């Protein structure tokens with residue numbers, strides 16, 4: 001059977017979900033219970049967490065512009081997702097997507113992580129670049145599993161305290 | 175490291191590879207040696223083989239129109255990929271892509287099959303619908319591994335002979 005339904009027009013789908021491609025929801029998954037996790041991400045949104053995904057991530061920035069804050073070769077780097085760009089992110093490259101534009105829309109495709117293969121979410125100290133806090137999670141429902149993880153970091157000065165230089169990470173916003 | 179390089183503009187990439195998105199090549203893989211197999215498929219092309227992929231396949235028909243001949247619920251069915259359509263194909267649904275239009279361009283995303291997980295390629299009898307021939311293959315390099323498989327079917331009346339009604343499949347073209 002066509003478990004995920006028939007083909008459908010993607011631009012019209014994006015238009016119809018515009019109200020979800022903005023705060024507070026920000027993103028909408030296309031199909032449920034599939035191996036390919038297909039998500040459309042809107043804006044605006046800024047975040048301070050870096051994602052450590054054990055599998056690849058595919059990006060196609062369909063509308064508007066965004067960028068990824070990365071750690072590459074031990075140094076902070078930025079990868080621009082200009083309108084029309086595609087990009088394949090290798091496993092475990094730490095990335096923090098920044099989406100300044102309202103009305104933007106990025107297709108993101110990932111794989112369902114099998115049991116035992118964990119995702120990481122990390123924050124780094126603005127002062128000395130040291131890792132401040134990492135949580136590993138079996139990511140089965142990101143829409144609901146991630147908000148409490150992030151909220152628990154923002155709420156704890158202990159979690160936000162840099163072990164190297166002592167600076168307390170600002171938490172939700174840079 | 176950014177093993178697969180920096181982001182780049184997808185429409186211009188498609189334009190620059192137009193000469194490969196037509197016979198005889200037909201399609202071009204975007205990145206090499208990745209877990210996500212990202213391919214752009216042009217046209218025109220018609221084919222008689224059905225693919226039995228043990229993992230999912232994602233389609234985004236960016237330019238032009240195409241369609242998939244399917245077996246769904248034991249019956250022949252057609253799924254149209256009109257310009258702008260996206261579609262997620264579940265594992266093992268037999269599908270035969272037909273791409274009548276020159277200048278068409280479809281983004282296809284699949285997963286590298288791990289060792290021991292085999293792909294099937296099948297032909298069915300136009301007269302009685304029975305399976306005529308199936309080859310299973312460890313698909314590591316489709317660009318080169320598939321042509322000899324297909325050619326060996328076209329070349330053999332034995333392979334093309336329906337075991338149920340005796341009709342010899344036409345081979346390369348319906």
Ligand SMILES: Nc1c(C(=O)O)ccc(Cl)c1O
Pocket residue numbers: 027039041057097098099108110142
């Ligand atoms: N990369 C993302 C993004 C992003 O790039 O902002 C948002 C949601 C999901 Cl599920 C993602 O995989």
Ligand SMILES: Nc1c(C(=O)O)ccc(Cl)c1O
Pocket residue numbers: 201213215231271272273282284316
């Ligand atoms: N679905 C396809 C097609 C297709 O849909 O015609 C062509 C090449 C590759 Cl590698 C595919 O996975």
Ligand SMILES: [Fe+2]
Pocket residue numbers: 051053057095
């Ligand atoms: Fe990610």
Ligand SMILES: [Fe+2]
Pocket residue numbers: 125126127128129130162163164165166167
């Ligand atoms: Fe620090």
Ligand SMILES: [Fe+2]
Pocket residue numbers: 225227231269
């Ligand atoms: Fe296929």
Ligand SMILES: [Fe+2]
Pocket residue numbers: 299300301302303304336337338339340341
């Ligand atoms: Fe037959």
